[PDB]
Amino acid sequence: GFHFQQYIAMAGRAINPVQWTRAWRRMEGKSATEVYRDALAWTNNQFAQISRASQYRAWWWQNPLGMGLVLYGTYKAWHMIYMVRKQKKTAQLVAAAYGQGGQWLNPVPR
Amino acid sequence: GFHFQQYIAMAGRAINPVQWTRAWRRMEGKSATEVYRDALAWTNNQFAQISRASQYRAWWWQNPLGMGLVLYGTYKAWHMIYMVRKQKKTAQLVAAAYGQGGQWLNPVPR
């Protein structure tokens, strides 16, 4: 793993409406195949940088579990940001629609 | 800051009853002045290691705020471990004795 700060900066640029106009202008004379190949090449470049530089270089976060801990932390962050947020909304929805625990209720006795 | 792992290990050794017998045996022919001077020398050695090595060396936790962030994190850890625990206990005590908010109640009206 590497360049998390650069990835945040990329997201920040992407969320900027000025960059939306810039991308609109850059899309002149351009194909979906070219865009997809560009993105795939970028991702490959990232993973190849990892595969190469891990052989001889160590980041500030190096630990006895290596990049496994960084990937776990990325996963846990994604989980807590997206899935737990969705869980909060779903909980409030179910509590407003049926009551707390309404989705685990037993079928009506016959 | 440095050697946090060593400090945890020191506390772990200190809490071991075998180390209590070892210290009891080591305390033979020993003075409180000697013990205090030893502890003071250890603390001075730590701070002198800091004062010297910060001039030329950077730890894995090095950041644009330097040791200020490490000391803030130490403080916050101490706070969350001790003081918030004490606040929880005091809250349950006050809630059992007077009710929630009992310490901020107004005086009895005359």
């Binding site: 190849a48 190469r52 001889y56 190096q62 | 950077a58 730890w59």
Partner: peptide
């Protein structure tokens, strides 16, 4: 990226708890 070099030396590294300083 390709591993360039004319060397046959199988080389691995161990890391410290200190950062590179220039």
């Amino acid at each position: 990226y390709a591993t360039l070099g004319s060397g046959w030396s199988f080389s691995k590294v161990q890391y410290t708890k200190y950062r590179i300083t220039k």
